Amino acid sequence: GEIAQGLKEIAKGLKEIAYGLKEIAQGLKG
Amino acid sequence: GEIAQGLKEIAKGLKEIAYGLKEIAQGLKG
Amino acid sequence: GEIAQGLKEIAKGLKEIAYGLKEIAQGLKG
Amino acid sequence: GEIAQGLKEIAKGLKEIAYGLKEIAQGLKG
Amino acid sequence: GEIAQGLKEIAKGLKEIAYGLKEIAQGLKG
Amino acid sequence: GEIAQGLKEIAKGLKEIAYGLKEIAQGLK
């Protein structure tokens, strides 16, 4: 139920964090 | 329920973090 | 519940991290 | 309990990331 | 549980990222 | 389950990022 939904939203947030960190690493290369 | 609510609040915090990381990447590229 | 309270405390800390990341982004833009 | 512990460790990692980004931004302005 | 294990693996990865960012900061300052 | 699998895949991606950041750091120093 909403526990599984809460964990799926956490996973989505972590995926978006990962993608921001990728963008940061790209920016630091040039 | 309050476990689900706490998990969704964490997810909200993670998504806010992802927004800040993306903005940092934007700032590195510009 | 103590677990729900702990999860809300985590969420509070994450939101504080988010604000600091937005500060870093603002400083990179000027 | 184990899920909350994982989330607290994630929050610690994100706090460390934010510190490293602030130090990077200072170094890029220097 | 495997969800807690995945969250702890993400925390380890985030801490590794934090160390690389700090090394980048140190390299810009030195 | 699918949540655990997705989290493990995120963790794999974070290791890739860490190793890009290592390359950057060593290129400065």
Numbering used by the authors:
A (entry chain C), B (entry chain B), C (entry chain A), D (entry chain F), E (entry chain E): 1 to 30
F (entry chain D): 1 to 29
Publication passage describing the model:
Expanding this pattern to hpphhph can produce larger α-helical barrels. Here, we show that pentameric to nonameric barrels are accessed by varying the residue at one of the h sites. In peptides with four L/I–K–E–I–A–x–Z repeats, decreasing the size of Z from threonine to serine to alanine to glycine gives progressively larger oligomers. X-ray crystal structures of the resulting α-helical barrels rationalize this: side chains at Z point directly into the helical interfaces, and smaller residues allow closer helix contacts and larger assemblies.
Whereas, the Gly@g variant with a = Leu, d = Ile had the beginnings of a thermal unfolding curve consistent with the anticipated destabilizing effect of Gly on α-helical structures. The Gly@g peptide with a = Leu, d = Ile crystallized in two forms. Although there are natural nonameric protein assemblies, this is the first stand-alone, water-soluble α-helical CC of this size. The second crystal form revealed a collapsed C2-symmetric 6-helix bundle. We posit that the small size of Gly relaxes this design rule allowing access to other nearby regions of the CC free-energy landscape. The first challenge is incorporating multistate design into αHBs, i.e. considering multiple conformations and/or assemblies that may become accessible in the CC free-energy landscape. However, this becomes difficult with increasing off-target states, e.g. collapsed and anti-parallel structures.
